[PDB]
Amino acid sequence: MPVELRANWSEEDLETVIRAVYRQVLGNDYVMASERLVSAESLLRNGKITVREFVRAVAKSELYKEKFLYGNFQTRVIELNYKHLLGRAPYDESEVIFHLDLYENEGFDADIDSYIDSPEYTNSFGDWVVPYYRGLEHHHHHH
């Protein structure tokens, strides 16, 4: 079931949204891992910023150099972001290579912003929708 923020929302629905995007760490009740976007929370809860922009805030909220970077592979990290922020995995090596080049040009911060302003992904996959696992079923043309 896709998580979406509708214009006619109840707080319980939004509570579901924010908890889906926020990084619920292995600590049950420690109010996240020092992850506090008080401005993003209030702006989103007022329906002023989009889920896209909220994704930005959460993705780079705390020091992103946690495990998936030096204790992982850049290719794998990109796939993680791709599947977590766009809800889908890359189609070819080219997407990964593009993001690798971007990571070298500006870094991980800019990598994140790429998943936001992406025009076709926003309109088609979800603008006020929270990235869910969108399994792309391999097909034989249309026959």
Every domain of the chain and the residues it spans: 4-131
- Please, are residues 23 and 35 in contact by the beta-carbon 8 Å criterion? yes
Terminus-to-terminus CA distance in the chain, angstroms? 29
CA distances 115 to 26, 48, 49, 86, 97, Å, are 26, 20, 16, 7, 15
Technique used to solve these coordinates: NMR
* DSSP track, 53-120: HHHHHHHTSS-S-SSTTTSS-HHHHHHHHIIIIISS--SSHHHHHHHHHHHHHT-HHHHHHHHHH-HH
Name the CATH superfamily for 4-131. Phycobilisome linker domain (1.10.3130.20)
